[PDB]
Design a protein around this ligand. Structure first.
Ligand code: LTV
Ligand code: LTV
Ligand code: LTV
Ligand code: NAG
Ligand code: NAG
Ligand code: NAG
Ligand code: OCA
Ligand code: OCA
Ligand code: OCA
Ligand code: CA
Ligand code: CA
Lengths: 269, 269, 269
């Protein structure tokens, strides 16, 4: 179980994450209304939400997404798109571990995700901090699905500690690094990480533990099925590094489960 | 076993379906001859068959294929390409069910397939009906492999009942809708659906039954192996909605089997 | 175990193969240095290795790679990229056997790989032979990973016999033809083929034997794991057409194993 308020946040950032896949949301002019197609983000559309920055083909690995101003919810939202292009998929395959001593000693992260974040960190840090300067009353949130959730998690780990909190909501994110990094992500302050998984989605099981990867705690596991509406009683908070019994179970994984986080995600043209 | 005449039709429309994947057959000038590369479609090439309308990047979901006039066999052939582009694949993942009451009461179809057809239906209907008017002695046939077979099935269901029959030949097609749609596609008058599957091809097993999908009856199951020439004795007709014992069996599915329907399909560059 | 000298060659051509995947190495000015990103090819970077020719989306099937002049090792290296684009993948799926009598009597090869090579053979032969004339004491080596190793193997078989040796180093290459072709690749004069495999990489098990495919002899099998450094003691030479007990065993195959040949290969953006 989670609270109705936390459930509402989970649903809203799932929709911001879904919105990052719509092509028109990666080259939109600054100041325009954020919209999706196919009912992919009705709660985002209802809000007074506009683009501060929209990006595609950025850095290395085709970093894509947008930075949104949400005057209804008083948010600054950095939403990273997950995998769509060949370049995205090739980045995901760069799965050796690379030192990220500039985030934490002993920490190592996925080479592809960390290389992609490093290549855009200066630009996106500046954009976020400009938005905070203009709307210091607002809350900074980073979000994404799948690869986008990995990028949001690395970006939050890197950019926290500069005065403003950064909350991260990830949906179906892969593991992003080793046990040291998983522990760092569990205990870091200056914001909260909400790592959301769905049933037996394969993606949070990748890369496998045998390659030196671990998951941060906690996990918010959606137990309701694919195409089934989610309620607050279908989400289980699971504590512990590499905790079993949520998504990390020794059963058959599933691909369609990756595409259903409150609604369809990754499918907006 | 099937009759030699039906076998000859199955082989011919497999080649029309293969031809839809050749890029040169999606942006060809009207009136030019239909050809493939290699031995992808020798029986189409032997016929006096020309393009009426060759299309790509159309509607939503990258609808691609051609409308052909076959003066040898006296056919008007609408052949849809299956999945090749990223956009095709994004459409395939829009696997929620959407109402299609304008086709049949209570029917629901795959959102991607039905949205794609809807986006091109007016244009393609007009072109088919223009050809029928000029060539009333010619038989109208819709065909395709995989996604293309799904589009041909939806299009046939929609455009039947306007004074001329439409036969549909699909090769390795996924399920396209709910039980009501499967029943409608089983009993609809004004043409026959020939739904052809091969051994343990995975695609006719998708989306899974659990998501609310069913298959129309009957099924023409090819039992001969991959790269094995098909004879009329290798094809078995299987009756019953969601029948088992043909392609819909609880065994390990296969990917190369999806590409061998009389010959290679999906591989023409 | 292999000799330290052969190990050094195996490691170097693995890095030349990895370098062919970097986009910047497929369209670079002649005479400029070959480099990669993030330790994908440090031994190539250390050498005086410069572009003689670079190519992308050549011929049919998106033939991509480069021709290098290596003054440190006295090499002329033709490195073919493996699979990245959709077009590459479609070519891989063209897995029927096609006659290659003009390469060797009785030989049949994978339709995709042989069609791709035929479409670039004249141009690349001219580039290789121009380089030979300019540096007649350098050693001609063709190399590649996965599809790129298949192309290097077919190209070497075709272009040998014209007055200079051609050695081939392939990494995780699929089978490329029938038993006659496998025998020819085992016995052909005018160069040596070093066919390198890793643990239970699936790709050297494709297409399956049952489709009419065989492997040339010998095989150099890397027994160390994925993400594990290779030493010369971890490589075993296995002789015999279609020999078992190296990569060709009846156990479960693995995908990540395909990406680790001395280091990560196929992942350079
Ligand atoms: C379009 C379909 C949308 C969902 C596709 C999901 C497919 C998963 C692959 C990329 C996910 C994106 C993604 O986020 O990247 C996942 C990436 O971290 C995983 O990298 C890998 O290790 C390679 C995964 C290969 C997948 C298939 C084999 C399983 C891997 C392990 C094999 C066993 C080895 C034992 C040790
Ligand atoms: C091989 C990797 C996966 C396929 C490729 C995906 C990414 C494609 C990128 C562009 C490629 C261009 C086109 C080339 C395609 C090459 C051949 C494609 C073959 C796959 C086609 C898929 C459907 C097409 C297609 O038409 O789309 C089907 C659509 O309705 C979506 O259906 C879904 O719900 C999504 C399914 C995702 C895959 C599910 C996993 C498989 C389930 C079965 C597992 C086996 C369990 C057996 C257990 C037995 C013992 C108990
Ligand atoms: C983005 C594009 C860049 C590449 C990213 C994807 C690369 C993945 C590499 C490994 C993939 C397999 C081999 C590729 C061929 C290389 C390659 O070079 O092509 C080899 C080609 O000759 C093989 O042709 C074939 O016969 C097709 C083989 C497909 C077999 C698939 C087996 C796995 C089935 C999984 C789904 C089935 C249902 C589950 C079964 C339940 C048990
Ligand atoms: C460019 C081309 O080949 N055009 C052909 C023509 O040569 C042939 O006489 C005719 C037979 O159907 O079809 C058309
Ligand atoms: C970096 C650059 O632009 N050119 C380099 C040059 O500086 C270097 O001396 C040489 C070493 O092989 O390779 C080339
Ligand atoms: C942008 O959003 C607000 C309402 O939330 C308003 O300016 C207007 O309705 C939207 N713009 C357009 C073009 O609809
Ligand atoms: C995580 O798997 C990144 C890709 C999400 C798949 C949605 C379809 C683009
Ligand atoms: C079904 O959606 C399409 C399968 C793609 C063609 C076969 C693989 C090249
Ligand atoms: C051979 O072409 C298949 C492997 C290509 C590498 C895929 C991405 C690393
Ligand atoms: Ca003709
Ligand atoms: Ca150098």
């Amino acid at each position: 179980e989670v609270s109705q308020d936390l459930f509402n946040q989970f649903n809203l950032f799932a929709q911001y994450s879904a919105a990052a896949y719509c092509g028109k949301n990666n080259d939109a002019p600054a100041g325009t209304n954020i919209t999706c197609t196919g009912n992919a983000c009705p709660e985002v559309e209802k809000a007074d939400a506009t683009f501060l920055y929209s990006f595609e083909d950025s850095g290395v690995g085709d970093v894509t997404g947008f930075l949104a101003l949400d005057n209804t919810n008083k948010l600054i939202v950095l939403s990273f798109r997950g995998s769509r292009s060949i370049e995205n998929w090739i980045g995901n395959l760069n799965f050796d571990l690379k030192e990220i001593n500039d985030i934490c000693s002993g920490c190592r992260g996925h080479d592809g995700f960390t290389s992609s974040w490093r290549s855009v960190a200066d630009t996106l840090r500046q954009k976020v901090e400009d938005a905070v300067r203009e709307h210091p009353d607002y809350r900074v949130v980073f979000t994404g699905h799948s690869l986008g959730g990995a990028l949001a998690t690395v970006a939050g780990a890197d950019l926290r500690g500069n005065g403003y909190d950064i909350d991260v909501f990830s949906y179906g994110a892969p593991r992003v690094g080793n046990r040291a990094f998983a522990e760092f992500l569990t205990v870091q302050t200056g914001g909260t990480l909400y790592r959301i998984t769905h049933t037996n989605d394969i993606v949070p099981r990748l890369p496998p533990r045998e390659f030196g990867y671990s998951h941060s705690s906690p996990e918010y596991w959606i137990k309701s099925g694919t195409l089934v509406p989610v309620t607050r009683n279908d989400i289980v908070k699971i504590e512990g590094i590499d905790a079993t019994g949520g998504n990390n179970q020794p059963n058959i994984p599933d691909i369609p489960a990756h595409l259903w986080y409150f609604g369809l995600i990754g499918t907006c043209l």
